[PDB]
């Protein structure tokens, strides 16, 4: 039987790549950063509170102009917030109320959302009719969508619950690329600043880097204990940190193909819902299930500060491209902007 | 503030008014969750994801029948955690899959995000169970060793008073689910066992009554009357 031979070959491959990773591990990030001045205590304060949602908020995405927002809730409404004046620019009704993701196009013309309906809907914000219309209903996934990203306003990357990701052509609506290789439900997506590489976490404690142009999985990282919930790249684009359900965040490196740091505490035993990075990548933010968001230091693996004020589960986070604001959604229908 | 800003604030006020009205209309209704195994008649309990709407005594409901997704339910169950109640349907005629149903029910009862939701049980296909146990070809004791020493609680639910072996069989199967439910839960949520025939239509009233008790219990806990 070829099964035994193939399993032995796979085991040998795993052993030799583990040895190769051990060969390059001549130091540790925590020891290298021991000589660096710590970030110290950080005290951020709520500046605005965006009321108007009447149900649990599931996703949020900052605009590329650093002023507009998109929030999705089980109420069935998509609301665009003028973050400076808290005005609701748009209120987009949804055919299906079970939405778990939202995305704001880099050009600002389009907004996307999806969830337990297996369709990624596209809304054209800037039209001469004056209202918000449905541009494309992207069907083809056999599982609930988890995260959507816009790629140059013409390509759309979607990850669903059927253990696969895809690349879409908005103009025609057909999948130009399908990404397979995950065994558990894919839960997050993140596009690198080069807009050429992206990674996805799944319910398998595995993070895989995908080449969107060729459609074949390039890298794979493992080491978490339970389901992966959120992934975001470092601003430099050569590294990324992931958040899992086992109450810890791990920082991964694409070049080193290793874990670099573990973000956990003895007093933290709750799941992690969203992860984001600062403008410089020095500050790491994570939205936990203790109704609060901690502020981790990406180089010292300590808690520089805590974001509290939500009386329910924190669901979505995000740092604006200007780096001047942080919006933290939660399950009490309240968006708070911290800076 | 300039004229553009004032007009934008007026537009935002109109948007907020519309959102408040829609939220009020949405809050005036009740939502449930439908779960069960195959061949359990979930779609015929009441006569991407299937949704059903029915109204009882000027109170309308929404059943979210999920069949599009595969057996993987551990991760998307977080959406249905603010619902009023969960309808759990079991095909009690077939004894081979009862253990799977018991295991499935236990996981949903002990689910972390489902720790405050009352579960409503619908043991379906009562007529099939009655004829199956009356034939005598298949015996429950072959699958459940506890069925022999279990005794009837000397309470007769049916009015016509059929064969007590059927009544003993029905109570034992119901007793398994009741014991599983009462093993843990701290009393935050309770089970509502029921026996529904395949052709039975008196299900909306049972759902309506059970939802009334659940909301009454919820009000008692929140109004500090405990």
């Amino acid at each position, epitope marked *: 039987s070829e099964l035994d031979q193939l399993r032995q070959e796979a085991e040998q491959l795993k052993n030799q790549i583990r040895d190769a990773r051990k060969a390059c591990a001549d130091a540790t990030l925590s020891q290298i950063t021991n000589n660096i001045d710590p970030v110290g205590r950080i005290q951020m304060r709520t500046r605005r509170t965006l009321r108007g949602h009447l149900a649990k908020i599931y996703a949020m995405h900052w605009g590329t102009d650093s*002023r*507009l927002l998109v929030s999705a809730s089980q109420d069935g409404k998509l609301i665009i917030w*003028d973050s400076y004046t808290t*005005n609701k*620019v*748009h209120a987009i009704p949804l055919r299906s109320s079970w939405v778990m993701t939202c995305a704001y196009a880099p050009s600002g013309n389009y907004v996307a959302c999806g969830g337990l309906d297996n369709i990624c809907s596209i809304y054209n914000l800037k039209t*001469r*009719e*004056g*209202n918000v219309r449905v541009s494309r209903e992207l069907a083809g996934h056999t599982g609930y969508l988890s995260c959507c990203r816009f790629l140059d306003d013409n390509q759309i990357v979607t990850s669903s619950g059927d253990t696969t990701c895809a690349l879409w052509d908005i103009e025609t609506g057909q999948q130009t690329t399908t990404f397979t290789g995950h065994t558990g439900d894919v839960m997050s997506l993140s596009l690198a600043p080069d807009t050429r590489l992206f990674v996805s976490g799944a319910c398998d404690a595995s993070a895989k880097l995908w080449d969107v142009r060729e459609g074949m999985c390039r890298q794979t990282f493992t080491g978490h204990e339970s389901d992966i919930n959120a992934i975001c790249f470092f601003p430099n684009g050569n590294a990324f940190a992931t958040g899992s359900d086992d109450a810890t965040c791990r920082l991964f490196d694409l070049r080193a193909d290793q874990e670099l740091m573990t973000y956990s505490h003895d007093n933290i035993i709750c799941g992690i819902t969203s992860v984001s990075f600062s403008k410089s990548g020095r500050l790491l933010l994570a939205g936990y299930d203790d109704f609060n968001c901690n502020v981790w230091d990406a180089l010292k693996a300590d808690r520089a500060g805590v974001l509290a004020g939500h009386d329910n589960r924190v669901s979505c986070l995000g740092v604006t491209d200007d780096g001047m604001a942080v919006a933290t959604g939660s399950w009490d229908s309240f968006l708070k902007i911290w800076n | 503030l*300039s*004229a*553009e*800003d*004032k*007009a*934008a604030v*007026e*537009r935002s006020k*109109m948007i907020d008014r519309n959102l408040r009205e829609d939220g009020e209309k949405a809050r005036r209704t009740l939502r449930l969750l439908l779960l069960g195994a195959d061949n359990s008649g979930k779609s015929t309990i009441v006569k991407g994801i299937f949704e059903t709407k029915f109204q009882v005594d000027k109170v309308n409901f929404h059943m979210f029948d999920v069949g599009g997704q595969r057996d993987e339910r551990r991760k998307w169950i977080q959406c249905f955690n603010d619902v009023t109640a969960i309808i759990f349907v079991v095909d009690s005629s077939d004894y081979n899959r009862l253990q799977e149903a018991l295991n499935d029910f236990k996981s949903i009862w002990n689910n972390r995000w489902l720790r405050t939701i009352s579960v409503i049980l619908f043991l379906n296909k009562q007529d099939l169970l009655a004829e199956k146990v009356l034939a005598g070809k298949s015996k429950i004791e072959d699958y459940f060793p506890e069925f022999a020493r279990y005794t009837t609680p000397e309470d007769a639910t049916p009015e016509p008073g059929e064969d007590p072996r059927v009544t003993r069989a029905k109570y034992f199967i119901r007793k398994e689910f009741v014991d599983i439910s009462t093993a843990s839960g701290d009393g935050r949520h309770i089970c509502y066992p029921h026996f529904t025939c395949a052709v039975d239509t008196e299900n909306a009233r049972r759902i309506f009554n059970d939802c009334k008790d659940i909301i009454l219990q919820m009000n008692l806990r929140e109004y500090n009357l405990v």
Partner: single-chain antibody
Amino acid sequence: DVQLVESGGGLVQPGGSRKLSCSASGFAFSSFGMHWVRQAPEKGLEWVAYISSGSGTIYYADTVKGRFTISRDDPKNTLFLQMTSLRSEDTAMYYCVRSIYYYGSSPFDFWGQGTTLTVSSSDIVMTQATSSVPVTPGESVSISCRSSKSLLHSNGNTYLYWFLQRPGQSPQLLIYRMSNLASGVPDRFSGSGSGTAFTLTISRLEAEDVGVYYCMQHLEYPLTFGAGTKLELK
């Protein structure tokens, strides 16, 4: 698909009455505020009134305050203007203008055909730099406007607007807030300026750029227009 057709023309004696109606189609009328803009044959554009979304705040011009009634019918998607106390000054051309206000909206992107009303027989003032300058196609022509007060608001937005009127056609929006080109306008027009001094720049002129250019302020009501610069082909 955006259409605006007016009605209620004819000849009226002074002191009479007339009802004007601007019918809107092809867009969400309930979400768009509307204006009335008056143009005398020999004077230029002049603001009249304004109705907000869903019959909200209503504004009237000082010269016509208390004599006109503006009504909105969202189900019918039509504007209503009531004309009372008619005089010889009101003999002019009346247009209905689409308008919408949010963070990045274009509030004067569309104009109606207009209707003809003939009658038988403080504020911010902007002065147009010139009324007539000959031009030759292929070169650049710069048009400047001045305002009696600085239009730069505390939020950083200035409210200068540029309107081009074809001979015999309704005016259109070129640039709003002196820097943003309206949709459909070719990238040959540009605007700049600060405080009270502003300029409108055209890269190269074509046969379609012959008309009269108006500078308008939207800082505070009432809205005012410039005298108008007319470009003559030469």
